[PDB]
């Protein structure tokens, strides 16, 4: 078990953002954080590289196209 997968699984229940390789940044509640980097959120705000933002009732990005993820640092301390 990796420290990053454990931090992604422990980051569920709070608000966090995830930017993919194509620049699409989806921010919302981490509903499902799988061990393969699959991030499923509900009611996530997705902003693409062009600058347009949209809202999704349920989004699910695979771990193969994951670039970075920003979660809260209050749980690490």
């Amino acid at each position: 078990i990796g420290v990053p997968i454990k931090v992604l699984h422990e980051a569920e229940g709070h608000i966090v953002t995830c930017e993919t390789n194509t620049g699409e940044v989806y921010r919302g509640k981490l509903i499902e954080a799988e061990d393969n980097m699959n991030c499923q959120m509900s009611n996530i705000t997705v902003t693409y590289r062009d600058g347009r933002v949209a809202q999704l009732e349920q989004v699910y990005i695979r771990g193969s196209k994951i670039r970075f993820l920003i979660l809260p640092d209050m749980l690490k301390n």
Partner: protein, 86 residues
């Protein structure tokens, strides 16, 4: 055998350059076998790394908090300094 090369830079503020060209400077508090890093107090800058910049040292700097750099897009890493007491 020892594996202390990853633990020597653990808990210190390092600035890593990813494959996309961005520079993330943060406290490397987490690692893994896949090269996935965890940066506490991580700041991402895409313009240039500020090293004695006369005109400006921070251009396009965005603070994230607990950033999770994926090991698939990792290119190289550089050490910046030791971590704080808090």
């Amino acid at each position: 055998g020892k594996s202390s090369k990853m633990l020597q830079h653990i808990d210190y503020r390092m600035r890593c350059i990813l494959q996309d060209g961005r520079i993330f400077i943060g406290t490397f508090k987490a690692f893994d076998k896949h090269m996935n890093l965890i940066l506490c107090d991580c700041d991402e800058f895409r313009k240039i790394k500020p090293k004695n910049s006369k005109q400006a040292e921070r251009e396009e700097k965005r603070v994230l908090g607990l950033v999770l750099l994926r090991g698939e897009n990792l290119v190289s890493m550089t050490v910046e300094g030791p971590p704080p007491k808090d």
